[PDB]
Amino acid sequence: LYSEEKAKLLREMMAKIEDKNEVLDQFMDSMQLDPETVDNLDAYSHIPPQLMEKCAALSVRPDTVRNLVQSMQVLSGVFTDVEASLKDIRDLLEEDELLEQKFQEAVKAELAEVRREWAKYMEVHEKASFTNSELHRAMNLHVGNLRLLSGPLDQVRAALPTPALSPEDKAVLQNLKRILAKVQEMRDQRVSLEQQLRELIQKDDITMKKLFEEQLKKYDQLKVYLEQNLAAQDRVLCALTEANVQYAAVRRVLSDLDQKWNSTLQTLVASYEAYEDLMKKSQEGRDFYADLESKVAALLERTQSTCQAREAARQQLL
C-alpha cells in the first residue's frame, strides 16, 4: 500500500537516470572516448617483454648472425666459381670446334657427351639461380633485424617510434583526461546514489493517511543529490566536446604512431622467427652448389683432357 508510493518515486528517478545515461552513452560512444584513454604514451617507451625475451635468447647463442652471413659467403663464392667453370668449358669447346673445322678443311662421342652435360649443368644453374636470389632477398629482409636484436637494448628501444608532442598538444590531452575523469566521477556517483535510493527504499518498513507525505520526506535529500548529478551532465558534455574538437588532430597523430609501432614490432618478431628457415635454406644452397661445383669441375677436367686428346690426335699433319 505504501511500497507502491516508493516504487513510484523510484520509477520516476529511474526514468530520469535512464534517459540521461542513454544520451551520455550516445555521446561517449560517438566520440570513441573512454576513461581507459588510448593515449598510451607510456607504452611507446617500454620494450615489449616478448622482444626482450628474444634478445636475451640471442645473447646465449652469439654466433647466429655470424654463422648465417658466413654461410652465405661460402655459398656466393661457390656460385660464381660454378659460373666461371661453365664459361671455361664453353670456351674450350668453341676452340675445339674451330680447330676441328680448320683441320677438316685441309685433310667425338666423348665430345658430344661433354657438350650435353655442359648444357645440362647450364640449365641446372639457371633454375637454381631463382632459389638463390630469393634467399638473398630474405637475407636483406631479416639480417638487419637479427643484428638489431643481437645488440644492446637501448638500440632496440631506439628503433621504436616515440611521440614528439608540442606542449600545446600535451595540455590538450591533459585537459581531455581531466574532463573524462569528471565524467567517470559523475557516473560512479550516479550508480552510487541509485543504490543508496534502492537500499533506503527496501528497508523503509513503516507501522488519517497523511503519514505518507511525512515518511516519504526521507528521500528528499537523495533526490536533491540525484537531480544535481543528472543536471551537471549537459555542461560537462559541452566541455568534453570542445576538448575533443581540440583533440582530433592529436588523435590522428597518435593513431598513426600506434600503427607504425605495431608494424615495427611485427617485422622484428617476423625476422626472429625466420632465422631458422634462413639457416636451413642457406645450408641447402651450400650443399646443392658444392655438389654442382664438384660435377662442373670434373666436367672441366674431362673437357680439357678430351680437347687435348683431339688436338693431339691431329698428327696426320706429320
Swiss-Prot record:
Ranges: TPR repeats: 4-37
Effect of R61W: In NEDBASS; uncertain significance
Coiled coil feature spans: 170-233
Compartment list: Nucleus; Cytoplasm; Cytoplasmic vesicle; Endosome
Family per similarity comment: Belongs to the protein-tyrosine phosphatase family. Non-receptor class subfamily.
Subunit annotation: Interacts with GRAP2 and GRB2. Interacts with UBAP1. Interacts with CHMP4B.
Functional note: Plays a role in sorting of endocytic ubiquitinated cargos into multivesicular bodies (MVBs) via its interaction with the ESCRT-I complex (endosomal sorting complex required for transport I), and possibly also other ESCRT complexes. May act as a negative regulator of Ras-mediated mitogenic activity. Plays a role in ciliogenesis.
Involvement in disease: Neurodevelopmental disorder and structural brain anomalies with or without seizures and spasticity: An autosomal recessive disorder characterized by global developmental delay, brain abnormalities, mainly ventriculomegaly and/or brain atrophy, intellectual disability, absent speech, peripheral spasticity, and microcephaly. Additional variable features include early-onset seizures, optic atrophy, and dysmorphic facial features. Early death may occur.
UniProt-recorded name of the protein: Tyrosine-protein phosphatase non-receptor type 23
UniProt organism field: Homo sapiens
